[PDB]
Design a protein around this ligand. Structure first.
Ligand SMILES: CC(=O)O[C@@H]1[C@@H](O)[C@H](O[C@H]2[C@H](OC(=O)[C@H]3CC[C@@H]4[C@H](C3)O[C@@]3(C[C@H](OC(=O)/C=C/c5ccccc5)[C@H](C)CO3)[C@]43CO3)O[C@H](C)[C@@H](O)[C@@H]2OC(C)=O)O[C@H](C)[C@H]1O
Ligand SMILES: [Mg+2]
Ligand SMILES: [Mg+2]
Ligand SMILES: [Mg+2]
Ligand SMILES: [Mg+2]
Ligand SMILES: [Mg+2]
Ligand SMILES: [Mg+2]
Ligand SMILES: [Mg+2]
Ligand SMILES: [Mg+2]
Ligand SMILES: [Mg+2]
Ligand SMILES: [Mg+2]
Ligand SMILES: [Mg+2]
Ligand SMILES: [Mg+2]
Ligand SMILES: [Mg+2]
Ligand SMILES: [Mg+2]
Ligand SMILES: [Mg+2]
Ligand SMILES: [Mg+2]
Ligand SMILES: [Mg+2]
Ligand SMILES: [Mg+2]
Ligand SMILES: [Mg+2]
Ligand SMILES: [Mg+2]
Ligand SMILES: [Mg+2]
Ligand SMILES: [Mg+2]
Ligand SMILES: [Mg+2]
Ligand SMILES: [Mg+2]
Ligand SMILES: [Mg+2]
Ligand SMILES: [Mg+2]
Ligand SMILES: [Mg+2]
Ligand SMILES: [Mg+2]
Ligand SMILES: [Mg+2]
Ligand SMILES: [Mg+2]
Ligand SMILES: [Mg+2]
Ligand SMILES: [Mg+2]
Ligand SMILES: [Mg+2]
Ligand SMILES: [Mg+2]
Ligand SMILES: [Mg+2]
Ligand SMILES: [Mg+2]
Ligand SMILES: [Mg+2]
Ligand SMILES: [Mg+2]
Ligand SMILES: [Mg+2]
Ligand SMILES: [Mg+2]
Ligand SMILES: [Mg+2]
Ligand SMILES: [Mg+2]
Ligand SMILES: [Mg+2]
Ligand SMILES: [Mg+2]
Ligand SMILES: [Mg+2]
Ligand SMILES: [Mg+2]
Ligand SMILES: [Mg+2]
Ligand SMILES: [Mg+2]
Ligand SMILES: [Mg+2]
Ligand SMILES: [Mg+2]
Ligand SMILES: [Mg+2]
Ligand SMILES: [Mg+2]
Ligand SMILES: [Mg+2]
Ligand SMILES: [Mg+2]
Ligand SMILES: [Mg+2]
Ligand SMILES: [Mg+2]
Ligand SMILES: [Mg+2]
Ligand SMILES: [Mg+2]
Ligand SMILES: [Mg+2]
Ligand SMILES: [Mg+2]
Ligand SMILES: [Mg+2]
Ligand SMILES: [Mg+2]
Ligand SMILES: [Mg+2]
Ligand SMILES: [Mg+2]
Ligand SMILES: [Mg+2]
Ligand SMILES: [Mg+2]
Ligand SMILES: [Mg+2]
Ligand SMILES: [Mg+2]
Ligand SMILES: [Mg+2]
Ligand SMILES: [Mg+2]
Ligand SMILES: [Mg+2]
Ligand SMILES: [Mg+2]
Ligand SMILES: [Mg+2]
Ligand SMILES: [Mg+2]
Ligand SMILES: [Mg+2]
Ligand SMILES: [Mg+2]
Ligand SMILES: [Mg+2]
Ligand SMILES: [Mg+2]
Ligand SMILES: [Mg+2]
Ligand SMILES: [Mg+2]
Ligand SMILES: [Mg+2]
Ligand SMILES: [Mg+2]
Ligand SMILES: [Mg+2]
Ligand SMILES: [Mg+2]
Ligand SMILES: [Mg+2]
Ligand SMILES: [Mg+2]
Ligand SMILES: [Mg+2]
Ligand SMILES: [Mg+2]
Ligand SMILES: [Mg+2]
Ligand SMILES: [Mg+2]
Ligand SMILES: [Mg+2]
Ligand SMILES: [Mg+2]
Ligand SMILES: [Mg+2]
Ligand SMILES: [Mg+2]
Ligand SMILES: [Mg+2]
Ligand SMILES: [Mg+2]
Ligand SMILES: [Mg+2]
Ligand SMILES: [Mg+2]
Ligand SMILES: [Mg+2]
Ligand SMILES: [Mg+2]
Ligand SMILES: [Mg+2]
Ligand SMILES: [Mg+2]
Ligand SMILES: [Mg+2]
Ligand SMILES: [Mg+2]
Ligand SMILES: [Mg+2]
Ligand SMILES: [Mg+2]
Ligand SMILES: [Mg+2]
Ligand SMILES: [Mg+2]
Ligand SMILES: [Mg+2]
Ligand SMILES: [Mg+2]
Ligand SMILES: [Mg+2]
Ligand SMILES: [Mg+2]
Ligand SMILES: [Mg+2]
Ligand SMILES: [Mg+2]
Ligand SMILES: [Mg+2]
Ligand SMILES: [Mg+2]
Ligand SMILES: [Mg+2]
Ligand SMILES: [Mg+2]
Ligand SMILES: [Mg+2]
Ligand SMILES: [Mg+2]
Ligand SMILES: [Mg+2]
Ligand SMILES: [Mg+2]
Ligand SMILES: [Mg+2]
Ligand SMILES: [Mg+2]
Ligand SMILES: [Mg+2]
Ligand SMILES: [Mg+2]
Ligand SMILES: [Mg+2]
Ligand SMILES: [Mg+2]
Ligand SMILES: [Mg+2]
Ligand SMILES: [Mg+2]
Ligand SMILES: [Zn+2]
Lengths: 144, 100, 159, 62, 103, 185
RNA sequence: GGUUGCGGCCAUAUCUAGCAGAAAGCACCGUUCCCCGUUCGAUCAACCGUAGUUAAGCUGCUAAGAGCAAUACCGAGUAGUGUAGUGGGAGACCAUACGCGAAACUAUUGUGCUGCAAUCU
RNA sequence: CCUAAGGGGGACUCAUGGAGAACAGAAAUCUCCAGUAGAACAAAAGGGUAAAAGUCCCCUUGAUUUUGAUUUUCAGUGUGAAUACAAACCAUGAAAGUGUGGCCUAUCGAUCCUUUAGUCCCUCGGAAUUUGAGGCUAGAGGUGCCAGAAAAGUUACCACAGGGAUAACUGGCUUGUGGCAGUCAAGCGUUCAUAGCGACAUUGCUUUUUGAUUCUUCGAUGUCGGCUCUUCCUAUCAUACCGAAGCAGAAUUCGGUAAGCGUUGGAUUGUUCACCCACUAAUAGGGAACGUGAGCUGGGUUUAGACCGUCGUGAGACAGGUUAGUUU
RNA sequence: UUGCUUAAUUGAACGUGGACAAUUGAAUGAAGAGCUUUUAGUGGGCCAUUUUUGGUAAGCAGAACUGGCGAUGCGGGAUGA
RNA sequence: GGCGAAAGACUAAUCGAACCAUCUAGUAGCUGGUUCCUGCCGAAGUUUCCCUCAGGAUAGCAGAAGCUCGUAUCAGUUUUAU
RNA sequence: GUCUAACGUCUAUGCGAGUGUUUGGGUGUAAAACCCGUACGCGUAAUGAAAGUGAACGAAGGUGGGGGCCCAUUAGGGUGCACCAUCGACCGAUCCUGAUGUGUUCGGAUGGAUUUGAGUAAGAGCAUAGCUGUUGGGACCCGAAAGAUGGUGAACUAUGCCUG
């Protein structure tokens, strides 16, 4: 529960970007029975940021509807555009932490087409939790 | 019966106290009647003053040595010094104290 | 009948190590403890004076007082919903310097040495530690290492 | 009658609503329990240190 | 329990302030005076009607008593008191142990 | 549903207005609500917060505190600001010439400030000669000197004052206060 | 490098059985007036360094040596275990998923290192 | 429990085994070697201890004084116990050191009152002296229900507040116990394991036994048995049709489908149960709130009267006997 | 600096002065951190997974950790804390 | 208290202590009940002591009032070292 | 779940090292309003059982922070109230030392101590009112089995007597 709170995953169908190391990998391992995760493609990142991209501005969830909001909040990190933000996320950049924490947790819908017959078992055993890797793109396509 | 960090009280209400409650609703009435009695006494004896002349005496104890107040009556020695007999003095508005 | 004495349940905790009973090696008595040192606490069962309570066996703390044969160590103990500062008087036989300080203290020196060297060369150096990162790409040579095919083996009984 | 004897159930839930707080650290710890002989002399050393610094600044000023 | 009739301990007397020789004696409680205020109050409370006015202890549990040593300094005659642990048996200046003897 | 990491619908826990219904204190809040909202001067934001404080949170400032604050190096001609009452101190031997702005002045305080060549002005008069609180020095009274604080945090070996109505040898001095009567805490 | 005195770590140093040991050192060794201690100058105390000896101590080497120490395409990713499922099975228990992961066994190697002072073919 | 079994120092090294020496042997005393503790350390057990903490010897009183800090139990209160220091005064040892009781973990006790010690100090209040009394500090006298009232019974003549927070019916889980049924087959059965049986084991079923529990009911579900009457189960006593035999017949035994159909009259007992007599095809076993009391009856149990025996000083008790006792 | 400590000019503690500047020394998060006063109800609990004790067992009794019911509706498990 | 050829029987439908009025609104850790709306927060059956075991006090959980400040340095989490 | 006596916290108000007119006196258009002052209560000194003694080494202390203010010019410096942590100083109690002196047993200078106080360390209180909480009171409402005091019954009935 604490691990999911520290990942800012405090509701169902909440999505977040994590840079893979050892500390964060052992974090996600602790939250593994409750999450579905994988490796997102560039088009998936773009679609997420374009449709459901929100920023944390004065602790408020603000739509990313203009590049001035991004510049005013991430120009000291050399992010001046929505594409700068997408690039910084995709090719994990020197300012991944600030850009991903500025991003409000993505609030996705349920999959169009549903889940598997039973969610709460590993993707390897025919469920939904754990690492699905390239099938995270299909799952996000279902849910975003 | 005992609870919290509170001072320990001494409320002496274990007898039939409610049968002996004196409420002074008549404070103003007694003030007014005292004034009326005072007017009656003044008109009774006018122009003779309503107050007898009282002496001045030191208050007893180490706490009231400094203060001086009105006594009860002039001593026999004091009346002797001004040539007034106590029996006569009591009839001319002078108070006498044989004890002091 | 319940039993809850001072050394209850310390049958194995306060035991000497196997083939390590007897006299105390004298480096224990030659070590020098200063106020502010970080020390591990481990009760020696053969010295019963100045012995810690069973709670402090295995705890690490700060020296605050130095006496003839003992040091005072400050321990923070959980009591309900907060910590209470505990002050335990321990003879130095139950105390050893904590090996954590020095790793920090060497990393401080290495950062200072690296920073001046980059400053000497007029370049920059990054001193923050990093968690282990995912490995990069690589090429596997197969000269002498052609892949060998394995299969699951059938079931056998060996009794 | 016979009742429940003991249980620690729900106690870690109550301790973590507002507690589990590490104690604050301060620059100067209290010297309570420190050796009296050291404490007695440490009083004289600090007083003399203040005098030396007071005189050095009194020199600077006038 | 065997305790010698002499002992050299610290003397709290202002003259001594040191270990001197002392005479060990068993302390004996003094006679209850009739004019102590508590015994004066007790006699008045019991008088008249009302019966027994203060409690009488019954539930004895101790089977021993704490022995108190009266140490009188031979130099300045200052007395001192020392309580011992609970002992059933106690002699003062008894025969010292003889180790090595036969049955 | 949400896994709440903090308590929901929690008021700030700070006064945003005076509890008093005095219309003239509201006028002062009216003035410093505008000043704090518009000057970027940290002085005006502090004054607005101090105008909300309750009586025990604005302890009286003696005329001796102002004298000691004016005796700081380079503070002799500063304007003393007290959001509360300034009381007199008959233990002072002398008082300087000073300008002091306060909510209230006692008769002795007003006499003493004016006797020594100073000024006793109100907080609205301050806002015109110092709308940003320039060259000012805020003085606050002792908060822990209150009598109620004597009994706060009472306990064994805590050294606080017991809540008691009478004082004497017969009142809470025997058992628990004396080693001859059992223990002492 | 050997040896002595004082040591640190406290068996890679211990234990058993053989063999060897130049120089110095150490040691055994000789004596009982004196200080001293004993049933006993055996231990302890003192004296001589004079009469003798490396026999022993000590040191080194040898042993498919015991023990100890270290290592591992040894056993074994086994036993166990944290986490998971509206998995199997009447049950006892078991399989699978994401992780952590022994002990015994087997084989090989090693058998004190070292600090201060003094001394020696 | 201990003036040492406390403290210091020194010397030595236990349990046990082997090999030897007059009486002497399994066990007396002496000698050597081996001997990591396999002993001893007051008392339970655990930990600890080998030029020692064990054994022996010498000297001692640190088992002393003033009080603070700290650890455990903990509210971070008390009590008990313990730890490291500060200031004294000592013991011991050549010394360094150690010693603030017992190698460590248990071995203990508030207010009020009394008593003793200390300070010989403060007070007895109009002022003094001396007795006496009262204060301050530290012990003891004790609360073992051990954070600490001062305390014998009976009620079947009984009362009240409540409780299904809790027993005495039914009901529910369980099935030890009770009852019933299987398998494996060493044996029994003149031969012959299984016509009929079947040990040692082991798997089950049942809730007509008794336990275990206390979930429901204590502002009450009328607690035994019988009589009367209906229905249901089958683990079938009889009656129908069949299979098997160590079935010649007759008789008898085991089994299958089977609860359609019946399963009695009496002596004694309140009895359920039992036992006897007798008829019969048979006189099977059970359930339905241990069916069935606004159906009855009221013999039993279990109010109040009374007798006896045993118990009790007694009032009274008996799950012992006896008699009389409102069934709306 | 000291009255503590050393044979000491040795140390102990607390200091004056100087050097090391934002990669000021891991991650992630942070409706911010810290502090105070005062007072309610409660002080019968129970259940599920796992660890686990007594018992033949129990819808039995008793513990450990967590999550629940109690205090809670909604969809499913027909029905059911 | 009476009275009892004795049942704790009778003493005005009242008897193992009559009836009447008062003390008395006797006390009750035990029953029952406890009266309008919406909004926000939101428990405990656990620690210690108690002739304590159906109750209290105490700490904990909770509300309210706020106060000093504004990223300062915190966390029912991970990494590295020990 | 009330009213009252006495209280804790918090808040508002008046005055403030003081505060409180209401016991009382004056006055009145008469239980109102208005006016008056001595005392007294609380506070402004504590500590000790008591006899008693009784709060500045210093800018009313030092150190690290500290909002705000001043000088700057990222940064930096100065000043830093409240408040926090820490080390000190002063007063009372306890213990130690014990000067000139003296009703020769008194006095207690001076210098100290891991002790101790509900203290000082440029006052903060008093009064009125309100909610909440406490205690005594019938005490949120209704409820015992009992106890006591003083009286009324032998027209039923028990027993004695008298007369039928
Ligand atoms: C003699 C008999 O059988 O009964 C005696 C009775 O006579 C005695 O009464 C004494 C009486 O006791 C009391 O007043 C109480 C005071 C203290 C309480 C209690 C007695 O003693 C306790 C209990 C225990 O102390 C005792 O037990 C003391 C007994 C004692 C005996 C005689 C004198 C003094 C004390 C604690 C240590 C504290 O003191 C106490 C706290 O509970 O005091 C009078 C002054 C004495 O004269 C009177 O003595 C006589 C002999 O008459 O009380 C004892 C408790 C009884 O056992
Ligand atoms: Mg993130
Ligand atoms: Mg569709
Ligand atoms: Mg589908
Ligand atoms: Mg799908
Ligand atoms: Mg599909
Ligand atoms: Mg589905
Ligand atoms: Mg499905
Ligand atoms: Mg969609
Ligand atoms: Mg037992
Ligand atoms: Mg036990
Ligand atoms: Mg261990
Ligand atoms: Mg000891
Ligand atoms: Mg300890
Ligand atoms: Mg850099
Ligand atoms: Mg009970
Ligand atoms: Mg139960
Ligand atoms: Mg309970
Ligand atoms: Mg003496
Ligand atoms: Mg009297
Ligand atoms: Mg008499
Ligand atoms: Mg009497
Ligand atoms: Mg005060
Ligand atoms: Mg070499
Ligand atoms: Mg030679
Ligand atoms: Mg010899
Ligand atoms: Mg010799
Ligand atoms: Mg040799
Ligand atoms: Mg040789
Ligand atoms: Mg080998
Ligand atoms: Mg597993
Ligand atoms: Mg599971
Ligand atoms: Mg399924
Ligand atoms: Mg695995
Ligand atoms: Mg011993
Ligand atoms: Mg000894
Ligand atoms: Mg000894
Ligand atoms: Mg020895
Ligand atoms: Mg003793
Ligand atoms: Mg306790
Ligand atoms: Mg304690
Ligand atoms: Mg505590
Ligand atoms: Mg404590
Ligand atoms: Mg204690
Ligand atoms: Mg000593
Ligand atoms: Mg006692
Ligand atoms: Mg008198
Ligand atoms: Mg006395
Ligand atoms: Mg005193
Ligand atoms: Mg006592
Ligand atoms: Mg008790
Ligand atoms: Mg008790
Ligand atoms: Mg009793
Ligand atoms: Mg009877
Ligand atoms: Mg009976
Ligand atoms: Mg029940
Ligand atoms: Mg069965
Ligand atoms: Mg059976
Ligand atoms: Mg049953
Ligand atoms: Mg039942
Ligand atoms: Mg019932
Ligand atoms: Mg009913
Ligand atoms: Mg019933
Ligand atoms: Mg019925
Ligand atoms: Mg019945
Ligand atoms: Mg059948
Ligand atoms: Mg039929
Ligand atoms: Mg019959
Ligand atoms: Mg019959
Ligand atoms: Mg029978
Ligand atoms: Mg029934
Ligand atoms: Mg039945
Ligand atoms: Mg029935
Ligand atoms: Mg039935
Ligand atoms: Mg019926
Ligand atoms: Mg009937
Ligand atoms: Mg019947
Ligand atoms: Mg009947
Ligand atoms: Mg009958
Ligand atoms: Mg019968
Ligand atoms: Mg009867
Ligand atoms: Mg009899
Ligand atoms: Mg009977
Ligand atoms: Mg019988
Ligand atoms: Mg009859
Ligand atoms: Mg510096
Ligand atoms: Mg790291
Ligand atoms: Mg509360
Ligand atoms: Mg509370
Ligand atoms: Mg409470
Ligand atoms: Mg409460
Ligand atoms: Mg319950
Ligand atoms: Mg309850
Ligand atoms: Mg669950
Ligand atoms: Mg499971
Ligand atoms: Mg249970
Ligand atoms: Mg409930
Ligand atoms: Mg729910
Ligand atoms: Mg539903
Ligand atoms: Mg449902
Ligand atoms: Mg179902
Ligand atoms: Mg009478
Ligand atoms: Mg009479
Ligand atoms: Mg009778
Ligand atoms: Mg009658
Ligand atoms: Mg009548
Ligand atoms: Mg009647
Ligand atoms: Mg009648
Ligand atoms: Mg109760
Ligand atoms: Mg809520
Ligand atoms: Mg409570
Ligand atoms: Mg708790
Ligand atoms: Mg709170
Ligand atoms: Mg912080
Ligand atoms: Mg590690
Ligand atoms: Mg008036
Ligand atoms: Mg009038
Ligand atoms: Mg006054
Ligand atoms: Mg002289
Ligand atoms: Mg003289
Ligand atoms: Mg003199
Ligand atoms: Mg003089
Ligand atoms: Mg103090
Ligand atoms: Mg102050
Ligand atoms: Mg003050
Ligand atoms: Mg009532
Ligand atoms: Mg009330
Ligand atoms: Mg009330
Ligand atoms: Mg009533
Ligand atoms: Mg009574
Ligand atoms: Mg008649
Ligand atoms: Zn003496």
């Amino acid at each position: 529960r604490k691990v999911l709170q520290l990942l800012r995953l405090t509701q169902i169908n909440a999505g977040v970007f994590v840079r893979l190391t050892k500390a964060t990998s052992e974090l996600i391992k602790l939250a593994e029975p409750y999450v579905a995760y994988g490796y997102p493609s560039l088009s998936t990142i773009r679609q997420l940021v374009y449709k459901r991209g929100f920023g944390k501005v004065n602790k408020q969830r603000i739509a990313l509807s203009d590049n001035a909001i991004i510049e005013a909040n991430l120009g000291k990190f050399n992010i001046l555009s929505i594409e700068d933000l997408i690039h910084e996320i995709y090719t994990v950049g020197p300012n991944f932490k600030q850009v991903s924490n500025f991003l409000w947790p993505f609030k996705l819908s349920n999959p169009n087409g549903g889940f598997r017959a039973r969610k709460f078992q590993h993707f390897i055993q025919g469920g939904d939790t754990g690492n699905r890797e390239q099938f995270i793109n299909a799952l996000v396509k279902q849910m975003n | 019966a005992i609870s919290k960090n509170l001072p320990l009280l001494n409320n002496h209400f274990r007898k039939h106290w409610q049968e002996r409650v004196r409420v002074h609703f008549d404070q103003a009435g007694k003030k007014a009647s005292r004034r009326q009695s005072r007017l009656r006494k003044a008109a009774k004896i006018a122009p003779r003053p309503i107050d007898a002349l009282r002496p001045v005496v030191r208050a007893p104890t180490v706490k009231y040595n400094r203060k001086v107040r009105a006594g009860r009556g002039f001593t026999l020695a004091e009346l002797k010094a001004v040539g007034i007999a106590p029996k006569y003095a009591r009839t001319i508005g002078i108070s006498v104290d044989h004890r002091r | 009948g319940k039993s809850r004495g001072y050394r209850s349940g310390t049958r194995y905790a306060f035991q000497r190590d196997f083939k390590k009973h007897g006299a105390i090696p004298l480096s224990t008595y030659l070590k020098v403890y200063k106020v502010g040192d970080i020390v591990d606490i481990k009760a020696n069962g053969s010295i019963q004076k100045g012995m810690p309570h069973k709670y402090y066996h295995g705890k690490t703390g700060i020296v605050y007082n130095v006496t003839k044969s003992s040091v005072g160590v400050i321990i923070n103990k959980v009591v309900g919903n907060r910590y209470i500062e505990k002050r335990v008087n321990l003879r130095v036989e139950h105390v050893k310097h904590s090996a954590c300080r020095q790793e920090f203290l060497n990393r401080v020196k290495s950062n200072a040495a690296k920073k001046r060297e980059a400053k000497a060369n007029g370049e920059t150096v990054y001193l923050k530690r990093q968690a282990a990162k995912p490995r990069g790409s690589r090429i596997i040579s197969t000269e002498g290492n052609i892949p060998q095919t394995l299969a699951p083996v059938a079931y056998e009984t060996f009794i | 009658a016979k009742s429940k004897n003991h249980t620690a159930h729900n106690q870690t839930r109550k301790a973590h609503r507002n507690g589990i707080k590490k104690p604050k650290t301060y620059k100067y710890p209290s010297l309570k329990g420190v050796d009296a002989k050291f404490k007695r002399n440490h009083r004289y050393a600090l007083h003399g240190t203040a005098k030396a610094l007071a005189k050095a600044r009194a020199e600077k000023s006038a | 329990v065997n305790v010698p009739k002499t002992r050299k301990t610290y003397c709290k007397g202002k003259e001594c302030r040191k270990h001197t020789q002392h005479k060990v004696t068993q302390y004996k409680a003094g006679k209850a005076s009739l004019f102590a205020q508590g015994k004066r109050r007790y006699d008045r409370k019991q008088s008249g009607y009302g019966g027994q006015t203060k409690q009488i202890f019954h539930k004895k549990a101790k089977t021993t008593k704490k022995v108190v040593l009266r140490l009188e300094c031979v130099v300045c005659k200052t007395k001192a008191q020392l309580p011992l642990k609970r002992c059933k048996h106690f002699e003062l200046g008894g025969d010292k142990k003889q180790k090595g003897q036969a049955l | 549903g949400r896994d709440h990491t903090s308590k929901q619908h929690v008021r700030s826990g700070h006064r945003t207005a005076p509890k008093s219904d005095n219309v003239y204190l509201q006028l002062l809040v009216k003035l410093y609500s505008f000043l704090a909202r518009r000057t970027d001067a940290p002085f005006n934001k502090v004054i607005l917060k101090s105008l909300f404080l309750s009586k025990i949170n604005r302890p009286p400032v003696s005329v001796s505190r102002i004298s000691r604050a004016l005796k700081q190096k380079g503070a002799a001609e500063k304007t003393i600001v007290v959001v509360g009452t300034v009381t007199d101190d008959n233990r002072l031997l002398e008082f300087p010439k000073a300008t002091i702005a306060a909510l209230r002045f006692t008769a002795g305080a007003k006499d003493r400030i004016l006797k020594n060549g100073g000024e006793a002005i109100t907080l609205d008069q301050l806002a015109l000669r110092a709308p940003k609180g320039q060259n000012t020095l805020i003085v606050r009274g002792p908060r822990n000197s209150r009598e109620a604080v004597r009994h706060f945090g009472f306990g064994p070996h805590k050294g606080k004052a017991p809540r008691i109505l009478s004082k004497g040898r017969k009142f809470e001095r025997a058992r628990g206060r004396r080693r001859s009567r059992g223990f002492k805490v």
